[PDB]
Ligand binder design. Structure first.
Ligand code: A1A10
Length: 319
């Protein structure tokens, strides 16, 4: 007859509609989210106490709704690039603790990165120093986060190629999503239509520039997708082993070499704009390339994220 008080909604609130503390049969409550930066999923938030003794929704679901963070926003919509303005890459994440590397925020508690960037520190059983909300790499003003768990892809072989160079970091606390910090969208099934050859993607990071030192400020380059055969043939020579460019990788860069990502950009998100939803999504992860960055005819190689959606949805749902 009495459902008790309702459960708190993460990134959302609860309101008694019938009255304050009215929890009896047919008592009406409303869930909601901060609709600016979160969006309710599952149901409309209207929940009624039913005869089976628990809060139940319009669709007949007895579990909470989900406040999913808004993704893919940008103020726009590294060799040879330009400085990123604030809000350009709000998903950008710096990862310290070993050497300098990067990731990309997914939701408010997950960071997509390269397995090669975080392999050494996970296997030392040390939490990752994760920072975001800042364009300057060495600034003391930043949003702090820490790793709860690190999930490296089970087909990744460290220092033995870069196939399945993908990893997920679970943040031990949720990040506050604002105009400065916003996750990147995961690609939908038809997102390959925005990733054909010669389609433009943007890589961003703090890695080496043409001057040969790490950048103090976040930089970025627009670069086009390269034909896969053209990229496989580009790396079919020593010192590279046979089969270095796999089907789980896309390549991006110029024949002339003027634009690339380098050391220190590892794990960053190579992103593409969905012109219909008007939202940026992650197409690639910064993985590898030639040792001499910006080398002509030596394209940057990126982990093909759309191949790893079932792996991503496995871990994020199950953990
Ligand atoms: N342009 C470019 N350089 C990059 C580097 C530096 C880098 O990764 N250098 C490297 C080159 C070759 C190998 C050998 C190898 C073995 C098997 N399969 C592929 C390659 C290893 C590392 C890091 C991150 C992004 C990069 N963007």
């Amino acid at each position: 007859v009495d459902c008790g008080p309702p459960d708190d909604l993460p990134s959302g609130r609860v309101e008694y509609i019938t009255g304050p503390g009215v929890t009896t049969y047919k008592a009406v409550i409303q869930y909601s989210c901060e609709e600016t930066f979160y969006t309710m999923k599952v149901n409309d938030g209207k929940y009624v106490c039913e005869a089976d003794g628990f809060w139940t929704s319009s669709k007949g679901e007895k579990s909470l709704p989900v406040c999913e963070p808004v993704c893919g926003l940008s103020a726009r919509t590294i060799y040879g690039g330009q400085k990123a303005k604030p809000g350009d890459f709000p998903w950008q994440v710096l990862i310290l603790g070993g050497t300098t590397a990067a990731g990309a925020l997914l939701y408010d508690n997950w960071v997509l990165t390269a397995a090669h960037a975080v392999y050494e520190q996970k296997h030392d059983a040390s939490a990752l120093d994760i920072r975001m909300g800042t364009l300057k790499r060495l600034s003391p003003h930043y949003t702090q986060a820490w790793s709860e768990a690190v999930f490296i892809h089970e087909g990744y072989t460290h220092d033995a190629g870069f196939d399945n160079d993908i990893a997920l970091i679970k943040l031990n606390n949720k990040v506050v999503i604002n105009s400065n910090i916003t996750p990147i969208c995961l690609p939908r099934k038809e997102a390959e239509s925005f990733m054909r050859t010669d389609d433009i993607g943007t890589a961003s990071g703090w890695g080496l520039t043409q001057r040969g030192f790490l950048a103090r400020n976040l930089m970025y380059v627009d670069i086009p997708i390269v034909d896969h055969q053209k990229c496989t043939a580009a790396y079919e020579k020593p010192p590279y082993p046979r089969g270095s460019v796999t089907a789980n990788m896309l390549c991006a860069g110029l024949e002339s070499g003027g634009k690339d990502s380098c050391r220190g950009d590892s794990g960053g998100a190579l992103v593409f704009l969905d012109s219909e939803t008007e939202r940026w999504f992650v197409g690639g992860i910064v993985s590898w390339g030639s040792m001499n960055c910006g080398e002509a005819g030596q394209y940057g190689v990126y982990t093909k994220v759309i191949n790893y959606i079932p792996w991503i949805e496995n871990i994020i749902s199950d953990f």
